[PDB]
Write a protein that binds this DNA or RNA. Structure first.
Length: 184
RNA sequence: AAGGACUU
């Protein structure tokens, strides 16, 4: 059980697969960034036709990071779409598979500043913007903000890490989804 | 296109 939990954080969803792509061609491509412990092309039960996506599982979260740092990836003559895998047990939550560049950061109360967030989050990727939300009339800080990156992957890594302490606060960090996006 | 045992 315990291993399985670990490897969930070492797994990439690979979508946009050529219908020619196999486990072997998938494994050949991703082995350039690490040692794979699993690799699967998901297929229709009846037809065995590729569902156009799969998973690869690496030996560490570092090897995942190295693979994602080397996008774009093309395999069997297609640029594919690699994404950190959402666990099956959370893949029915609203918004779970929605890919965004914006992060919601809550639980930061009144003392937390832009620079706190810039600081804490800059190590994860390139930040475009940072907004701390304040009341419209009173300008009282409402205790949350948003960080937008230039790429969705930082956001995926951040949220998957789950626990974050920011300016002495246990923050709630999630994707910042629109109402539309929340219907996915 | 979001997980293999659709493997009683």
């Amino acid at each position: 059980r315990k291993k399985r939990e670990k490897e969930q954080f070492r797994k990439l969803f690979i979508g946009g697969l050529s219908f020619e792509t196999t486990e072997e061609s998938l494994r050949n491509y991703y082995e350039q960034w690490g040692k794979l412990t699993d690799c699967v092309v998901m297929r229709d039960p009846a037809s065995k036709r590729s569902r156009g996506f799969g998973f690869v599982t690496f030996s560490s979260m570092a090897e995942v990071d190295a693979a994602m740092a080397a996008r774009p990836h093309s395999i069997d003559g297609r640029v594919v779409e690699p994404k950190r895998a959402v666990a099956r047990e959370e893949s029915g939550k609203p918004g779970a598979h929605v890919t965004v560049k914006k992060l919601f950061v809550g639980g930061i109360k009144e003392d937390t500043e832009e620079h706190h967030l810039r600081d804490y989050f800059e190590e994860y990727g390139k930040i475009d913007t940072i907004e701390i939300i304040t009341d419209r009339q009173s300008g009282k800080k409402r205790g949350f903000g948003f960080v937008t990156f230039d790429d969705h992957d930082p956001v995926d890594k951040i949220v998957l890490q789950k626990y974050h302490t920011i300016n002495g606060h246990n923050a709630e960090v999630r994707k910042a989804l629109s109402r539309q996006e929340m219907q996915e």
